[PDB]
Design a protein around this ligand. Structure first.
Ligand code: FES
Length: 98
């Protein structure tokens, strides 16, 4: 099973919905389909790949940087996030965490 993940960053000209297997991280699946997303550690330990969820849900249990307030506010570490429903994610949201 796969989910439709809408990735959005209009300064990049990015507004694209891709099919992501339920066992693949969003960053990896995006890259495979030719999308460029920001990243550094790829380990869920920083905020470089941070995005913000505006629709749908993810499993990011592997992440270890975002606190509970930040998770509640919709933030996601795309390098370690599986989609769990069709979802919409604003990418390059690191500065919004400041
Ligand atoms: S690139 Fe460091 S948490 Fe995703």
């Amino acid at each position: 099973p796969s989910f439709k993940v809408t990735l959005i960053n209009e300064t990049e000209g990015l507004n694209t919905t891709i099919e992501v297997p339920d066992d693949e991280y969003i960053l990896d699946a995006a890259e495979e389909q030719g999308i460029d997303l920001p990243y550094s550690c790829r380990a869920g330990a920083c905020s470089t790949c941070a995005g913000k969820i505006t629709a749908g849900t993810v499993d990011q249990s592997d992440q270890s940087f975002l606190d509970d307030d930040q998770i509640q506010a919709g933030y996601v570490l795309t390098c370690v996030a599986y989609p769990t429903s069709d979802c919409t994610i604003l990418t390059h949201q690191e500065e919004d965490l400041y």
